[PDB]
Amino acid sequence: MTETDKKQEQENHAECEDKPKPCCVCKPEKEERDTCILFNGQDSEKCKEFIEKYKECMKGYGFEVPSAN
């Protein structure tokens, strides 16, 4: 496990992403969710994936859904 991790794995040759990655968050999840809703989401059982995934995402971040009040 140590002598097999000493080397790299190589996922993609020549990088192309310069933007930072805060990890977890839900920045992209929000866009994808809204998109699905625009298509056929709303109440259909084809958008529950984005909704549930969004909830868990923010949960791991540090806050469960942005408070409005």
Query: Structural domains in the chain?
Result: 1-69 (1.10.287.1130)
Whole-angstrom Cα Rg for the chain = 17
* DSSP E strand stretches across 1-69: none
Residue 24 counted as an annotated binding residue: yes
**Any idea how long the chain is?**
69
Residue 23 counted as an annotated binding residue: yes
- C-alpha 62/C-alpha 69 separation (Å) is 19
Q: Structure tokens of 67?
A: 């408070």
Q: How many CA atoms lie within 13 A of 35 on its CB side?
A: 7
Provide CB contacts within 8 A for 58, sequence distance 6+.
Answer: 25, 26, 64, 65, 66
Quote the crossing angle between the two packed helices 27-39 and 48-61, to the nearest 10°: 160
